[PDB]
Amino acid sequence: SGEYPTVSEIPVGEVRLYQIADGVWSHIATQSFDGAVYPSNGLIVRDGDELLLIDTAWGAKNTAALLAEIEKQIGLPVTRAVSTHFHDDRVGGVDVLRAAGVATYASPSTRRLAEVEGNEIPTHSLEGLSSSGDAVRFGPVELFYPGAAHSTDNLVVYVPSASVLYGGCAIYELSRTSAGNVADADLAEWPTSIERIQQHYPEAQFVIPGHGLPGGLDLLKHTTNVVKAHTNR
Numbered sequence: 001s002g003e004y005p006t007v008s009e010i011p012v013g014e015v016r017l018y019q020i021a022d023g024v025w026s027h028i029a030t031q032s033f034d035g036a037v038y039p040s041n042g043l044i045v046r047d048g049d050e051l052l053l054i055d056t057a058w059g060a061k062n063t064a065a066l067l068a069e070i071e072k073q074i075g076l077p078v079t080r081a082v083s084t085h086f087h088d089d090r091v092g093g094v095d096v097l098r099a100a101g102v103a104t105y106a107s108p109s110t111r112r113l114a115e116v117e118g119n120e121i122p123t124h125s126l127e128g129l130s131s132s133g134d135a136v137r138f139g140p141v142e143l144f145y146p147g148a149a150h151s152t153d154n155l156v157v158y159v160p161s162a163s164v165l166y167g168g169c170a171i172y173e174l175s176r177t178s179a180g181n182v183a184d185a186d187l188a189e190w191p192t193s194i195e196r197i198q199q200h201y202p203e204a205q206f207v208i209p210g211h212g213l214p215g216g217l218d219l220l221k222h223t224t225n226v227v228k229a230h231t232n233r
């Protein structure tokens with residue numbers, strides 16, 4: 001609760017946690033590219049007496065700090081992590097997680113793409129997500145493959161107990177009014193994929209983008225608007 005952490009509050013290589021609801025936090029880290037600093041969010045979901053992590057904190061150093069920060073602020077073991085797509089902001093740091101005894105998971109689609117890209121590859125495979133609209137339970141969350149959007153493999157994560165939808169990088173914060181990196185995106189399918197998310201999680205109360213400030217379900221329509229504008233450039 002209180003003010004959501006921004007790059008302001010986060011020195012290079014450090015991580016802040018933010019409690020969204022009982023037993024649900026986001027993690028916020030920063031990375032430089034092209035002379036600008038960007039924030040990046042992931043999720044932490046309490047799983048009985050242990051923790052499920054969604055996404056790395058974008059690199060080995062940040063990910064080591066994330067674990068130290070969890071160890072300091074929450075004090076429960078991270079037993080499993082899921083990466084929501086193959087790019088380095090989601091899997092960069094997987095080796096760090098693995099060395100700390102976290103079981104790292106991604107879909108076969110993400111694992112294959114990470115391999116092709118020369119990125120870190122989560123060890124464990126998540127079955128049953130290969131077709132658009134597929135959902136699978138994973139402890140205290142549901143994993144959902146809405147179809148291609150920011151990437152062909154992107155997953156979204158819902159915490160049914162707290163009504164928290166984590167859209168990852170397929171969903172943009174309201175402040176982002178122009179598309180980010182779309183090299184790997186399927187612009188043609190992105191709005192349909194968003195429509196699947198909307199139809200599957202109409203009860204979501206909190207929506208967390210890959211980057212920047214949380215909001216509500218309006219972030220889905222906002223993303224659609226931004227992607228369509230880019231499509232029509």
Ligand SMILES: [Zn+2]
Pocket residue numbers: 085087150151169
């Ligand atoms: Zn990406």
Ligand SMILES: [Zn+2]
Pocket residue numbers: 103104123124
């Ligand atoms: Zn294992």
Ligand SMILES: [Zn+2]
Pocket residue numbers: 089168169210211
């Ligand atoms: Zn991202």
